[PDB]
Amino acid sequence: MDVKHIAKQTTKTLISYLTYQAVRTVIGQLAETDPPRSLWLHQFTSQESIQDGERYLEALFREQPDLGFRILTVREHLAEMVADYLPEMLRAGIQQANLQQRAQQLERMTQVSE
């Protein structure tokens, strides 16, 4: 199979997710220093969340570019903090989820005989 395609697409998904986690973080920071801007950023994201992180940020920059810049910085820091954990967590997570899926289906199968 095309591992390069899947690795790239996986990476794009990851960056989009961390972008949105960065948006949540800045919302929280604005709570400590400037509460009206927290609500604005939350509301903007409700109609603007349904898109790739890069398209969301371009939308944000048109309206509040100080916030767009803070998010670039936070998302880079979040990525630096999590990146090296991801391989083992993914492998362990998929092993655990697979076990649970199999055990549940087997329990279903033997329950349909009881």
Place this chain on the structure above:
Amino acid sequence: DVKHIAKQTTKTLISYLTYQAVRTVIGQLAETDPPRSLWLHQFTSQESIQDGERYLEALFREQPDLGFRILTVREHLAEMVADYLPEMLRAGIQQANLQQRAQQLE
């Protein structure tokens, strides 16, 4: 919180790889059992707006052999991708931020 973040990130990745594994099995079925390939494509088109684990539970109710197959495939996809991610994510987020900043210098 870094710990909550790396966990939630992981959940998101597992969901994504689950749906990638679905496409793999659709492709395999396109060879061995075209009507079931179509069936699985159609099911997935209606059941994908949920976490991968809930998708699998639903699939297991209908076509359990396909659920079992997707579990094995997603494990393989994880193994094929996982060790690229620390580099791809760092390099990717650096280039994406460079692009954003170059754009907004306009």
